[PDB]
């Protein structure tokens, strides 16, 4: 039960956005700026005392990205909510000392030091950390570390399972998507199938759904490995196969996964929220 | 896990509908024709073996509406899915013998023979039938009987909690909504609050959410009764107060609750699905 709130009346006969698709054919929202009232969403999630886990791998030289990643997450990611960052690294002492807002904590998880890094992210999330995540957070968001937050990323993304439109392909036809196309791979998608091309750098959902997705991707990747085949874009190829067959309940627009150096700032993007570091 | 399916690729940069709002500010879809691919939704719900309960009251002279209500439900309501109709009447022998498709059954529940009819629908759904519904169906849809189905009403409506835009008010400002305006009533909504005006004739959701909603509306109605006040539109006024404070997870367009005699067939309605009997 939400408290009284005063905000602009939604207007049934006035679309919020007319330039973009805001709902998928299986009735999941596609989250763009203008489509949500964050005050309502914040109330709904706070009333449940929601905790959001953020997983990020920073192995070898990639530890250098953590300072900007974490400082910008503090400014823009789930502010006002409980957050638990899980940083997986082979160099725990290289993790920067970043000051965190109240209600936010960071755990460093030490791992060994691409195909094999790829398999290990799915393996780590689905197998090794399974019990810890179920006990500690409500939702999990799994992201690349070579990124920074430049604008709000909040509870508008939360749902049982979400994927994010890859910023290279949101305007493409399915035939141009770089899905795995060899039928010998568990990630195979035929040319006449496919809704969207989802980016491997930002996906998430409830803990139970994220564990299901990463367990499935890991099992598929191990089958391919035993069959001597490696999918074209590795874990991203398996993520796409999974989300084709298990539709996500929210799709995030490329506001949530962008690269301004390669793609600029198109009129359709009203906010660049989470962006590649050039 | 859905099977392979071949259907038109959704296009991110081509909205499905540009004339109407297709998502609420709390990211619930607003279900209009063109927004959903029923083949995908049918697959998702069948794979869960979904059972849909349909409740309808037909007391006194209103038993005369059951023949057309039920015959048209057989042609258009959840066809292909398991359905259990629950018909509440003071005249069980007046219930028409309507032939049902496979997987569909009808139970007649005998009750006693407006304020008090109104209270009794909420009471009946929340209290008397509580255990039976939890054991027998996954979702419950509660409708008026003076209605007929004229076109598809399917699993695109199913979600934890839905309400339907009342067809008289979908283009109105919140100040014109006929919410209960006296602060002495539990259904009171101030002039600056309100998202939509939902119709009392078609609402539903998972069994647990529908039981929560009808239990809350019944409790509120009893408080008003003890305080000597009756809300302006009875159970509909309390439904509106509930859905203002507990946002629905899907909103149905007025395609799902229409009256062609009073309102015609506007260009914005591509299908008239469930309609008043003139
Ligand atoms: O030494 C590493 N250390 C490390 O921590 N990583 C993590 O993996 C992420 C993905 O690598 P990245 O260099 O960012 O490649 P992208 O092209 O942006 O990755 C996309 O494609 C991948 C395909 O398998 C993934 O799906 C990834 O999620 C995508 O964004 C990084 O952000 C890090 O979090 C990756 C590497 C790495 C190891 C070998 C080759 C290239 C990178
Ligand atoms: O003798 C009845 N028998 C009966 O079964 N009903 C059921 O209540 C429903 C609502 O009554 P109805 O005559 O259809 O009124 P509407 O104006 O279309 O109702 C709307 O407003 C109501 C306000 O309390 C409800 O919210 C209703 O769901 C709305 O559609 C009917 O369709 C029947 O299912 C209603 C009556 C009735 C009893 C006294 C006065 C008017 C109607
Ligand atoms: Mn990256
Ligand atoms: Mn009626």
Residue numbers in the entry:
A (entry chain A), B (entry chain A): 65 to 177, 181 to 345
Which passages does the manuscript contain on this structure?
Three of the structures belong to space group P21212 containing 2 molecules in the asymmetric unit whereas the fourth one, the AAGlyB-2 complex, belongs to space group C2221 with only one molecule in the asymmetric unit. The single chain in the AAGlyB-2 structure shares the least similarity to the other structures. In the AAGlyB-2 and AAGlyB-2-HAA complexes where the 5-substituent of the donor analogue is a phenyl group, the electron density is well defined throughout most of the only chain in the AAGlyB-2 structure and chain A and B in the AAGlyB-2-HAA structure. Finally, as for the AAGlyB-1 structure, the AAGlyB-2 shows well defined density for the galactose in the tucked under conformation, whereas in the AAGlyB-2-HAA structure the galactose is not visible except for a few blobs extending out from the nucleotide β-phosphate. UDP-Gal derivative 2, which differs from 1 in the nature of the 5-substituent, has a Km value that is approximately 10-fold higher than that of both the parent UDP-Gal and UDP-Gal derivative 1. The kcat of 2 is 1–2% of UDP-Gal and lower than that of 1, by a factor of 4. These results suggest that the 5-phenyl substituent in 2 is less well tolerated at the donor binding site of AAGlyB than the 5-formylthienyl substituent in 1 and disfavors the binding of donor analogue 2 in a catalytically productive orientation.
One important example is the biosynthesis of human ABO blood group antigens, which is the most important blood group system in transfusion and transplantation. GTA catalyzes the transfer of GalNAc from UDP-GalNAc to the H antigen acceptor (HAA) (α-l-Fuc-(1→2)-β-d-Gal-O-R, where R is glycolipid or glycoprotein) to form the A antigen, whereas GTB catalyzes the transfer of Gal from UDP-Gal to the HAA to form the B antigen. Among these is the enzyme AAGlyB, a dual-specificity GT, which can bind and utilize either UDP-Gal or UDP-GalNAc with equal efficiency. Each letter corresponds to one critical residue in increasing order such that the AAGlyB chimer would correspond to GTA-L266G/G268A.
